[PDB]
Subunit: 121 residues, 3 copies
């Protein structure tokens, strides 16, 4: 039963993420370049004397960048499984994935300036 | 015009979600296992005497788990439409999808402890 | 090296989004229909005398609608690159994508009423 085992694969998310995040590191490491880089900047603001709700709101935007870059890495991982015809095919999906994190970042930066003006100081 | 009707399909999202969420329930029900399960736990904290902003922030993390599991179900639904070659192919995309909800949950739990310490009590 | 250049494509997100958001406007403009439409409604509440945290929380739900519709446009863009067999194939993925923005909106509306009752006035 491939459909039943497909759900079992989701149930064991940690194990699954091993080969996925492996292919991510190998093919597209924007998870680290933007995802974790932004995470670390928030960690600094959170370490400093700020408000607990700002801390939460900043982490929420961190998840938006991390997750979308995981989706971008997923695109290239599957292309590698077959060949150059697919490396070109998914370029439209990857273009939209770039647009997705751009939108996440641009609007997050607006909220970031607001939060810094009201609570970071 | 397939492209024009493609947008019309998005315009009627409710109708579309019928066959999609059908395939989700059949193939991968992590939408219920993690998505709704976490939702119900927030509903309890929100029913109790807490702050309205915490209520909102918890619902926001609920949407992060629900939506990503809908994306995981989408992966297996399309594999079923063709066969075992695709059930194996998308396993990399599914691995990254597992990583996506793991990241959503792990960082959400950090915000959850913060919110519980500042407002749940 | 297609995998290395795949990451380079992500590094230049702005450039990539050109052809992606081009295909979005051509094939599926729900980014504008729901994404920006909701954004503009928040801009009005934010322009009015409200709380800075509400302003941030509303923008966060705007990003949820915008991003998911970018993912919906991505689906149809790739179908156009090959043909009608794929326009039908991805319909399950598109159905789940419709479910994704429905869930984002429905739970966001609950948070929206809460925020309006506590801060909009």
């Amino acid at each position: 039963a491939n459909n039943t085992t497909g759900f079992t694969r989701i149930i064991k998310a940690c194990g699954c993420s091993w080969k996925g995040l492996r292919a991510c590191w190998i093919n597209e490491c924007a998870f680290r370049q933007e995802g974790v880089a932004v995470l670390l900047a928030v960690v600094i603001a959170c370490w400093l004397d700020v408000c607990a709700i700002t801390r939460v709101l900043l982490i929420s935007s961190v998840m938006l960048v991390m997750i979308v870059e995981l989706l971008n890495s997923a695109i290239e991982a599957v292309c590698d499984r077959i060949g150059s015809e697919y490396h070109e095919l998914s370029g439209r999906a990857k273009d939209m994935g770039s647009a997705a994190v751009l939108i996440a970042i641009i609007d997050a930066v607006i909220t970031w300036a607001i939060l810094c003006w009201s609570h970071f100081g």
